[PDB]
Structure 1
Amino acid sequence: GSEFMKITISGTGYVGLSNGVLIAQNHEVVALDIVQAKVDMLNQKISPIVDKEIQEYLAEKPLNFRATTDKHDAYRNADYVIIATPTDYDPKTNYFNTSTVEAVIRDVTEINPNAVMIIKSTIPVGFTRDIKERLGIDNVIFSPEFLREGRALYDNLHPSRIVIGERSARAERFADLLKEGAIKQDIPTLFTDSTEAEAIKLFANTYLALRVAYFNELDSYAESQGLNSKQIIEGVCLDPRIGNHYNNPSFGYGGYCLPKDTKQLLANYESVPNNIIAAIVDANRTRKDFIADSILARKPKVVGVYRLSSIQGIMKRIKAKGIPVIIYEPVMQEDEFFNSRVVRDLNAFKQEADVIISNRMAEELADVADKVYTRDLFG
């Protein structure tokens, strides 16, 4: 009976909780977490994470949602179990820690072998086909998540698309759950085989890194040649095949996904001839070298870093040349970061820095704009 199902969420971070609150509008959702304090909060309709829509829906909407620390209570009778536990890929060792996902697969297989597991956690390419073969089970399907931390429920209410890594009626019924709870209508939906679904986010994020790296190389050329980067970029981006988005120069692509995913994809190309995949990684190092060299050519005695992630790579290079860096970051509470002073008073920071670097311009740097170096054009 697909009319009213039980869906268990294993993992209460933004991915699991966003999916759980979305589905609890129409089905029975039970959230499993190992931490009793998190379970008690959820049962009191308090979100353990910061996400405005998740907190609003938990507090104000009638959701058939509850939490528990009991695995048997959580998995028994579940039609689907969404696995959204933490995973991490380390590019230095090429190790992808999937232990939390494998622990859930172990527990569901033992407690309810008829449940269909949907992995939303990030996993390595080929993970699902391999784990099914290893354990001799069939009830595991991967589905990528395209959510932004802080707007995770909003992104599930208005998704770019839904992709489920199995071609079957049970995969389509899970996609239907995601569409039923959404506000956006006629959401693009794609069903693929397993390993293909697991490769989508690495190829999508690596294209975004390539696009930023390309506009950054155009910007390196414009600076080197004394040209106006904004004029060139706006003219280029008026071609509708290119578009006016994701084209703002910076000190390099950063954030929590692009640096690691581009490297993870390159490792997957160890036996595949390529030049672009490897260049996306190299390009970022070259761009940071160019930006650092431009700053160092101004012969500053102290460089001020306004806000703290590619700017970290710039700071590293400036310090390697023996020039002190001071940091302005109101969110940090320590007085030192990577051996550099964190200055609390903005006016003291502005006065001492000979060049203030910022990945993006800010209103509060307006009065010292003359000594601000930023390649931001569009805000």
Structure 2
Amino acid sequence: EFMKITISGTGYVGLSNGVLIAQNHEVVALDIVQAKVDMLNQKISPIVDKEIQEYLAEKPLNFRATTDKHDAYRNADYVIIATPTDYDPKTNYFNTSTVEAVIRDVTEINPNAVMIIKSTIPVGFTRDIKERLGIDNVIFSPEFLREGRALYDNLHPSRIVIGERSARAERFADLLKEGAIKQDIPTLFTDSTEAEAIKLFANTYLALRVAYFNELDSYAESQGLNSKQIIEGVCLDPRIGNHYNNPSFGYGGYCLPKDTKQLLANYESVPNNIIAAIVDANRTRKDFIADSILARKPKVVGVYRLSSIQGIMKRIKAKGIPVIIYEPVMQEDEFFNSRVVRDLNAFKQEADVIISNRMAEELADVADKVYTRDLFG
């Protein structure tokens, strides 16, 4: 087979999948930003990913880009939708407008193309949109990549999951396996809504794991015990393992805080204690960490690098204690009403306690006033 696969959205997800598949098939990448398309046609990547830029520039890929929807979608066997979406936990609103616009466009231009959604969507999205528009050609397949290793994670994926049990779903899984470097990749075919719930449950388990080791750490600090001794002893049980067990100021990042809340909203009519506790536990852990810091009676707290550390900052400021921030990447001189100190040495002198989620070489000479719960970094 030599198929045509269109990518809608040339960001980390679209380009990871597109470059992977362009090694063996015809890929046409569609974006709405003409300048990104022009760059791609010059074999220049519009994003930061080593492998994508290396592949685009150095390997023979049957790849091209366009802003023309008709040129992109005509004769496509599959269209991978990788446009932006966003879930807002405060309102429980999942903005899927770009995905719905693409489904609209493909349905109109090429109703025979099979759309594969890689964008994050709410649980039940695909079953519902098919029913609403009265179409059958949409399948969800979760994307497991990490930014910065976008192409790498699809060259060496943990597994491939396609949310339809059919020969056309299997042929799509084959495209992902064919472009990968890793061999005998675990492949799983499920029904739609089930596939859409996988990442929420996987990411929430990771947040649960971090929240648990953080509660173990709260206990160890409270009791004057060596947290590393306990954690290493526990994690030597092969059913538990030595990963994702490094204490911190709370789970953070781009996915976990929102996904745990998104999953909890989905449990609104399902009795549970663990799902709700995962969200509450992070707030409790931040209160514990802030209270530990405040018990040292600092006159100035220094925050070394800026994300769960933001919650610690908020709590310290709520008690009227000034916070100064060391963050080279930030160019402003203020962040949430607190001074950003550009000079590391001045920051070190002024701060009575320096908090940092993870230890860093450059804090070694002031280690005595650094508060971090990092054990394994």
Give structure 2 stretches of 5+ with no counterpart.
none
State the distance in 1 between where 2:44 and 2:312 align: 40
Aligned partner (choices 111, 114, 119) of residue 116 of structure 1: 114
State the secondary structure of the residue aligned to 2:277: helix
State the distance in 2 between where 1:308 and 1:57 align: 32
Deviation at 1:243, TM superposition (A): 0.2
State the distance in 2 between where 1:344 and 1:41 align: 35
Deviation at 1:108, TM superposition (A): 0.1
Deviation at 1:298, TM superposition (A): 0.1
Deviation at 1:24, TM superposition (A): 0.1
Aligned partner (choices 53, 56, 59) of residue 61 of structure 1: 59
Deviation at 1:374, TM superposition (A): 0.1
Q: CA RMSD in A?
A: 0.2
State the distance in 1 between where 2:347 and 2:193 align: 50
State the distance in 1 between where 2:105 and 2:131 align: 17
State the distance in 2 between where 1:95 and 1:350 align: 42
State the distance in 2 between where 1:36 and 1:122 align: 24
Deviation at 1:328, TM superposition (A): 0.3
State the distance in 1 between where 2:32 and 2:249 align: 40
Deviation at 1:176, TM superposition (A): 0.1
Aligned partner (choices 210, 214, 217) of residue 216 of structure 1: 214
Deviation at 1:277, TM superposition (A): 0.1
State the TM-score, normalized to the length of structure 2: 1.00
Give deviations 1:6-46, integer Å, cap 9, x for gaps: 00000011000000000000000000001110000000000
Give deviations 1:251-309, integer Å, cap 9, x for gaps: 00000000000000000000000000000000000000000000000000000000001
Aligned partner (choices 124, 132, 135) of residue 133 of structure 2: 135
State the secondary structure of the residue aligned to 2:286: helix
State the secondary structure of the residue aligned to 1:26: coil
Partner of 1:362: 360
Deviation at 1:322, TM superposition (A): 0.2
State the distance in 1 between where 2:11 and 2:325 align: 31
Deviation at 1:54, TM superposition (A): 0.4
State the distance in 2 between where 1:337 and 1:66 align: 42
Deviation at 1:75, TM superposition (A): 0.2
Partner of 1:273: 271
Deviation at 1:320, TM superposition (A): 0.2
State percent identity of aligned pairs.
Answer: 100
State the distance in 2 between where 1:174 and 1:106 align: 21
Deviation at 1:52, TM superposition (A): 0.4
Give structure 1 stretches of 5+ with no counterpart.
none
Deviation at 1:102, TM superposition (A): 0.1
Give deviations 1:60-95, integer Å, cap 9, x for gaps: 000000000000000000000000000000000000
State the distance in 2 between where 1:208 and 1:101 align: 27
State the secondary structure of the residue aligned to 2:358: coil
Give deviations 1:215-259, integer Å, cap 9, x for gaps: 000000000000000000000000000000000000000000000
Partner of 2:37: 39
Report how many residues are paired: 377
State the distance in 1 between where 2:5 and 2:338 align: 48
